[PDB]
Design a protein around this ligand. Structure first.
Ligand code: BEF
Ligand code: BEF
Ligand SMILES: [Mg+2]
Ligand SMILES: [Mg+2]
Lengths: 117, 116
């Protein structure tokens, strides 16, 4: 089960379809707030996390998740593309960091890598 | 302890210095052959793997490592930058894939992530 957190609706819907195509169960949410509601009500094996979100920055939310001792693999998937952004994302507790625009099949391969580990 | 497999000597030496700066013990080798000798004689917690190597392609070597049920995190670090290359590297068993040219500090952060 994958949770995708992404505020662009068109992109989010396509990401859900992609995860389902890969044989995962997938829930998509558009805010950090909705993510917290979903994390409380369901168990996820991996989280895909956009950083630019309307209510709380994804990086701040990730910090909170790790402070709550959540250990799910997190892949950051974001338009924030600077070297500083990538390093801070990883050091905040992300397991991978993939910049937009990106190919769907690379996302799939990186999710496979994260999961078999 | 980190093993770095990279055939460009100037780059390899700098990578070793970088790993040591991060507080790791680090051995560097320039071929898949030397890597196999080192893997037999030492225990490594992570392997950094270049693909273009003189005697055996790094991707082929990685396939052999995984077939021998070696479970060390492997980060591929390579000039091979096509989408097919990246996917192939990951699916062959790499845990991350970072294309050249790259920043040392991103390599460091990705190695930290893998070791977590
Ligand atoms: F909104 Be994101 F970070 F692409
Ligand atoms: F020789 Be590599 F793949 F940069
Ligand atoms: Mg966004
Ligand atoms: Mg080479």
């Amino acid at each position: 089960k994958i949770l995708v957190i992404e505020d662009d609706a068109l992109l989010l819907q396509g990401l859900i379809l992609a995860m389902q195509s890969e044989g995962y169960v997938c829930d998509g949410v558009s805010t950090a707030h909705e993510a917290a509601l979903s994390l409380a009500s369901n168990h996820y094996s991996l989280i895909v996390l956009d950083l630019g979100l309307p209510d709380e920055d994804g990086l701040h939310f990730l910090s909170r998740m790790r402070r709550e001792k959540m250990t799910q693999p997190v892949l950051i998937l974001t338009a924030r593309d600077t070297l500083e952004d990538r390093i801070s994302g990883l050091d905040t507790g992300a397991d991978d960091y993939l910049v937009k625009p990106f190919a769907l099949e690379e996302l799939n391969a990186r999710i496979r890598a994260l999961l078999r580990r």
